[PDB]
Amino acid sequence: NKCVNFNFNGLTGTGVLTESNKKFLPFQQFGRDIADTTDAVRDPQTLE
């Protein structure tokens, strides 16, 4: 809920990080926008 520079598994970027209701299948670790920018991620330590 704060603006941050993030890095998940080497995906560096900038934004707000928020809870989400998206149900990624076990083989999926990033989700993307129609612009192909990442707009969701599963956290690598606590799998939300």
Binding site: I34, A35, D36, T37
Partner: protein, 48 residues
């Protein structure tokens, strides 16, 4: 002449209430600006 005008304004209610296509000249202008912005967003996903 008054009854005919009042009846013809009646057909304007009924026509606009019934059909989908009557405002096509306005909906097409909204569709062109929406399609041009959708294209400009999709185009970000290109490699070039």
């Amino acid at each position: 002449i008054a009854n005919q005008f009042n009846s013809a304004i009646g057909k304007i209610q009924d026509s606009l209430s019934s059909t989908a296509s009557a405002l096509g000249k306005l909906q097409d202008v909204v569709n062109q600006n929406a399609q041009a912005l959708n294209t400009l967003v999709k185009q970000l996903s290109s490699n070039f």
